[PDB]
Amino acid sequence: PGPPGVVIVEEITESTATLSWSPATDNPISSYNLQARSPFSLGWQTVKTVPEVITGDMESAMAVDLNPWVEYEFRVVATNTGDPSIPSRMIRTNEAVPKTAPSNVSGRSGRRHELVIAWEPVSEEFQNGEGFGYIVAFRPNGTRGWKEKMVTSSEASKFIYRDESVPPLTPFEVKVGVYNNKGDGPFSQIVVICSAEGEPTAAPTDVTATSVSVSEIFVVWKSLGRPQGFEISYWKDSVETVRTRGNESFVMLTGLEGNTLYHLTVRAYNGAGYGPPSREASTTT
Amino acid sequence: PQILNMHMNVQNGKWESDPSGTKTCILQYCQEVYPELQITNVVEATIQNHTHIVIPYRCLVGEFVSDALLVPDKCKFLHQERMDVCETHLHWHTVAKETCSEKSTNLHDYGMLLPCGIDKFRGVEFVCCPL
């Protein structure tokens, strides 16, 4: 069969677009099929219509189950299956309240009095309107009331709250909701994230370095900021830094020069930063 | 940082008089009082040294960060915003208070949103609490 002429979108709602088209050429047509495309669609995709089956005598239909505030583009296909029609003009569905809360509400590393809350941003496909934003609600675990913060950036993925009265590693119940111009949306499920844990504050003590071979030296050492690992700097008399195999209390320097005096310092680190250096140890291969 | 005229000593926590001793009865004064800070805007919130009850102007530093409002239990967190308007702080305070009155509640706390000028904003956040 021939292709339809072009799609004319007559009425637009939040999830519904009433559209018509000029009929295709019968070379007896069984049905017309409707497809739409959005910046979030993986190409052209079929749409649900009213009526469920668009018979051959019908030149119009009502596309349903569309997403609010999403740009769309329609085309018709005839089947007795022929070529699709010319794509319609770019329309956009009407605004609606948001129905999708952000996922992966979690925490991040921060400073000693920061509560770093993070979340996966919501794409425009599920913002459902202009003026989209987030509502970050948090409270100490077990308390009643909430502290709420409005994040007006639609692309924002985290928020940092600074409170000098909140001690480090304090658990907080956290919700992250959504809103737009037409009204508020739902909140995410309550998650519990701890605050702060700043940079490691204590330096390693009893740093003992001992020569093992002509090119190897074994080092061993022993708070407020939890250590995620230790970085060890060693110089001869050429600065070189090395790290541990996780949160361990030792390293083995390799590839050193024979019968050579080396100096050494150790310091811990985590996601927030580094700690203070240790006392300078030294041995000779 | 907030503001003869008197200002808040951010290092001690007390109120000091005008540095030159001449300025009496806003954004430019915030910047001259705190030259080490980047004062970008001002917004409305008892001082002796003879007592006087005044509502000080907060010298907003750097980019605007909306205030974190406290929502006690059994209260509601509400907010209004219009990208096609730009009103004053007194307007949004009255809007927030009248909105709680329409719902037969009281205005417990409020804050400004989306600045659009010197002490003028495009939105408001507030908390209505039951009677």
Author numbering:
A (entry chain A): 670 to 696, 699 to 751, 755 to 896, 901 to 915, 921 to 968
B (entry chain C): 32 to 34, 41 to 62, 69 to 88, 93 to 96, 108 to 189
Original authors' sentences:
Contactins (CNTNs) are neural cell adhesion molecules that encode axon-target specificity during the patterning of the vertebrate visual and olfactory systems. Because CNTNs are tethered to the plasma membrane by a glycosylphosphatidylinositol anchor, they lack an intracellular region to communicate across the membrane. Instead, they form coreceptor complexes with distinct transmembrane proteins to transmit signals inside the cell. Finally, structural analyses of five CNTN–amyloid pairs indicate that these proteins interact through a conserved interface involving the second fibronectin type III repeat of CNTNs and the copper-binding domain of amyloid proteins.
